[PDB]
Amino acid sequence: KNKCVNFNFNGLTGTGVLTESNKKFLPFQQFGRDIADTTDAVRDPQTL
Amino acid sequence: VSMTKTSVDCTMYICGDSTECSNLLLQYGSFCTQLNRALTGIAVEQDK
């Protein structure tokens, strides 16, 4: 966390800084989108 | 009299977490820097 790293979760590739937000991803939700309809939040598929 | 001071990054704005986007954006030349100087120039113009 708090470091610029490359993410790869269920094909949602990209580069960003990992942080902890209040996003409550349900068991079915894959990834979150920002105002620009771009991936801004993902979930570890191995463990919730 | 003036507006609120802001700093919008041309690279992240045009290309939100995308590597291939930045590769083609750099081919356009200084239009990225002009976007920063444009929005910043407005803020500097309000300071004038």
Side-chain angles (χ1 to χ4, degrees), chain A residues 14-15 39, chain B residues 16-17 19:
Chain A
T15 303
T39 303
Chain B
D17 190 6
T19 302

Side-chain angles (χ1 to χ4, degrees), chain A residues 6-42:
Chain A
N6 180 270
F7 305 104
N8 192 337
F9 295 87
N10 303 331
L12 286 301
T13 58
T15 303
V17 171
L18 178 56
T19 55
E20 186 177 0
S21 66
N22 66 329
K23 295 180 176 63
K24 187 177 179 180
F25 283 86
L26 300 173
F28 300 92
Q29 294 292 340
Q30 188 183 2
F31 65 99
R33 295 181 177 279
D34 69 329
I35 294 163
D37 304 330
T38 55
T39 303
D40 60 349
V42 300

Side-chain angles (χ1 to χ4, degrees), chain B residues 7-46:
Chain B
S7 182
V8 181
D9 199 326
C10 75
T11 306
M12 184 60 194
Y13 169 75
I14 293 163
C15 301
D17 190 6
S18 177
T19 302
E20 295 291 351
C21 182
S22 60
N23 297 332
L24 278 296
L25 182 60
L26 291 168
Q27 297 180 358
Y28 285 91
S30 61
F31 298 164
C32 210
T33 303
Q34 286 175 3
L35 181 59
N36 293 327
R37 294 178 178 179
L39 298 172
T40 305
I42 292 161
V44 170
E45 187 175 1
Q46 294 294 347

